């Protein structure tokens, strides 16, 4: 119902899953899709293809809200960031900027123990 022209794309990429959230500016969410939603259960969540599918779904859903140019922010390591941002452009959006915003501590809290596998 509400019409916005400019938007923000948030990509939450990890070694386990990829979450794509489309917001307007000021951070109010409009649409979201994840690799878990489009099948790809379990270990299949982390492949770049699943991230691409989720990004395509989220972009198509946001197109109903009807915005044409968006700014993407990538937060996190792992596969699917590049595939997801490519899929957003391939849907027909104009990307205005692309930057990394993963949080980095200035030596804050202690991380968990190292895995002995």
């Amino acid at each position: 119902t509400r019409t916005v022209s400019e938007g923000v794309a948030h990509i939450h990429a990890s070694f386990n899953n990829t979450i794509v959230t489309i917001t307007d500016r000021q951070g109010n969410a409009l649409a979201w899709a994840t690799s878990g939603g489009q099948g790809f259960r379990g270990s299949r969540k982390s492949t770049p293809f699943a991230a691409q599918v989720a990004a395509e779904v989220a972009g198509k859903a946001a197109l109903d809200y009807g915005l044409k140019n968006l700014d993407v922010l990538v937060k996190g390591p792992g596969p699917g960031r590049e595939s997801a941002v490519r899929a957003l452009g391939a849907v027909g959006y104009k990307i205005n900027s692309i930057t990394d915003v993963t949080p980095i501590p200035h030596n804050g809290c202690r991380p968990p123990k190292k895995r002995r596998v």
Partner: protein
Amino acid sequence: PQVKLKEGEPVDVAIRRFKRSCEKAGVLADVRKREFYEKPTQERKRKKAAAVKRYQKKLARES
């Protein structure tokens, strides 16, 4: 990063300028380092090995 994109820049080329920006920044290296806690003994050993390797590289490139 803040990779702003020109009128004639394609989407793929913009993303490519992006991974170069982020690879130059090296944030993913910090993310890799942060995920598990490393003991001070292991950190000291790693830095000692790095210093030895750097000096060997300097000697090799000088002669």
